[model samples]
Target: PIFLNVLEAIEPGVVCAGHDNNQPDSFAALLSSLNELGERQLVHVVKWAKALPGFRNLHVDDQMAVIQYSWMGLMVFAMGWRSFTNVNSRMLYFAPDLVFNEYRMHKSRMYSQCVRMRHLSQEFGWLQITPQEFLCMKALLLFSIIPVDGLKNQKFFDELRMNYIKELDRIIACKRKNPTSCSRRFYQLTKLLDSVQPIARELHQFTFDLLIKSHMVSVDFPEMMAEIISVQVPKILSGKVKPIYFH
Candidate 1:
């Protein structure tokens, strides 16, 4: 409860802060902006996380648990949606300036991964997703309970999360050219979420490898992001179902 209030107090100023910023032009500037990207994304994720009902009611530690588990997927979702507006130019933008192209990630370990995500962005174009649909998808990702280890309130949050699916349906229904078309749209949107997981999963593994595991690494991976990857390790290792459960 207290945490929610704390975030509400701060969310207003910072939540909107990074929207228009360009990619850093100087090599130093790029590193500076990119260095802050993960942390800044988590900050926005926490603000949205606080907005979840009963989020404050959960134990403080559990709230942290949820944030760590939830942020990566939401980060990827935000990346996808933000890039949605840039698709006509065959671009997937990272910041206003850091647009995703094979050339942009030339020196990165995950250049191949960025290229794969770019291919998926073209597929995202097929969904014709709206901003409202993106919001609903993000809520689904943020409230994902499947990864939360032992949180005591499954039924509570499940219902809350399911409401978003209904919200998604209503969104699809509004543009319904027909019932079948609406259902098809809903299926396609869900399928798009499924399709994007490979990108998120690969990026998660990439960060874990480069930031946390590499012997030569100098910088510490942000703790929340590290924890996020830790939670996914079992799933990654177990060879579990490849498709993510939207619930």
Candidate 2:
């Protein structure tokens, strides 16, 4: 109850992308707005992660590194849930104002990614994911990726990851009386969680490529987004950093 309380209290509220829907959608405009939304969400994500139970046990540098590496997955997962609850998986709810319809999805040049995300959104209903489970799973994602060489305080990171996994188990088993049922639920949830990594990686690559030719494309990447994409994201692309997959 305490863990759930903390997560529920710290959960980020609705964020809007500030997209001007009146303007005709174009690749540059859509991407620029998405970049702006990413910057906005990063601010909330930093605060949310810092407040998580036991999150401060890691070295300060490790905390920041983990946040940078995992930010894309965190945002993508939360957006999927938002899409699920709000639009019933009909569209990509990047934010309250920047929801992506078919045309926008195609215009964004991320139609394939959108389709995969829509499938993920549908899984929320397919599995009947409870809100508490969504909260815990999202927090778990913050710890799911790291440098393959290990974080500055790898032991602390490992311990923190273990505790989060245990919390997920506790949440899953709370209502289930049978051990078999609990195990099955855990299997399903972990599988669903593992599915998020590939989607995030696809986005990581897409954004990185977009930033490389941003000047030519007239796409504007905000300050923080540009920095992370140029710095931290390269390590991921080069296989220096990697996501820890349950599967």
Candidate 3:
């Protein structure tokens, strides 16, 4: 009753703000489904955790789940902008301390997660334009794709991507900054960039494995890769999934 009342009070504003998290049903129904999904995810993790031989079993699954959920929260932070933009998200203000704690925790987990997961997404030659392999390759664009129009090699739009990365590199490389400095500093970036190809290959393989194991992706993924000379490399090079440049 209490939660339903709150939802009723705010559904109109949430819809207006563009969360549209309100799917094809009532607000209460949507909440119900999200709760159900949470339960399912927990079950999935626990089953995997118990199957592992003890190194303190379940801890890794807990760590993985905690990190995945919290990191996922931040990766989609932009989604809540509307909730904040309107007065609908006043709950955010009250939760700053807890939210901040979750933020740090999320980043910690995601940092470790990225190293392994990046290997998975790249296996299929898809660049992660978003977090959590959120973008389905069949549904969206990748950095590798150039627009069909004549927009190749223009440094303007590409500069945004370049500068974003270089700025992060420069920040960590600032030697006089602090003792608890970034582990992979800005100065070491060129080395990182140089190895991006193999990184992509590793992640691509990871995603391919997940797709094959889970059977989520279009299965043509593997047979297509066996002969990259004719199929895979060109699709990636030509930005087949998404436009190479942005507006």
Candidate 4:
């Protein structure tokens, strides 16, 4: 959630930091300007994290891990589509840093989890795979939702999936080469991607008419992330409620 300040306006879900009217890319330039301030803020957030309730209850290192994990989600909403991308070069770089350190730190060694009704959640959107291939499953997500029409061939799409799986592995493991073994491990990460394609079609149409043409998120202005994520995005995804990861 890059928190497009447009002008640094910290409204409800609008921004994390920046001028309220700075405009879209305007805040991007602030990247270098506020580099020091951002670093200090990270330090400050970590400093007080322990003081917060439940902070001390967890392991010392776990605290930092949780923040790192959540940053992924937060950065996406605030920054728009580039969150996952720009994120590759950051804290999530080291494989262990993400998988074991950040992801596993929460230690539900205590308990927990989720699943939606198939009929209600997805219509006959049958997707496949085993559990071991879960990480590689990211391809289904990255490709499906952000449709790259050029790579639609079954063979080509297979390659794209493989490419995406490796791309992420590289980010996490820093391994330049794509993993060779498709191995056995695979699980349906999201039926939502395939199921929601129909709806996304209309969405592309609307956004092309609105955002790109009307330019809400662009217009040298600050936009509300809360409104987009919690509000607008759900409706877009919910049009068919394809029962992917959600309703």
Instruction: Point to the candidate with the largest TM-score.
Output: 2
What does candidate 3 score in Cα RMSD to the true structure?
19.7
CA error at residue 145 for candidate 3, angstroms: 8.7
Better of 1 and 3 by TM-score: 1
The positional error of residue 122 in candidate 1, measured at the CA in angstroms, is 2.4
Clashing pairs in 2: none
Model 2 TM-score on a 0 to 1 scale: 0.99
Models ranked on TM-score: 2, 1, 3, 4
Cα misplacement distance, residue 188 of candidate 1 (Å): 0.3
**Each prediction's number of clashing residue pairs:** 0, 0, 18, 28
TM-score-better candidate, 3 vs 4: 3
Q: Model 4 reaches what TM-score against the true structure?
A: 0.24
Give lDDT: candidate 4, residue 148: 23
TM-score of each predicted structure versus truth: 0.74, 0.99, 0.25, 0.24
Residue 117 of model 2 has an lDDT of 94
Q: Ten residues in a row with the worst lDDT in model 2?
A: 144-153
Candidate 2 lDDT, 1-247, residue by residue in tens: 9999999999999988899999989998899899999999999999999999999999999999999999999998999999999999999999988999999999999998889999999999999999999999999999999898888899999999999999999999898999999999999999999999999999999999999999999999998899999999999999999998998
Model 4: lDDT of residue 47:
46
Compared with the true structure, all predictions reach lDDT values of 0.59, 0.95, 0.30, 0.29
> Considering lDDT, which of the candidate structures 1 and 2 is the better prediction for this target?
2
Ranking by lDDT: 2, 1, 3, 4
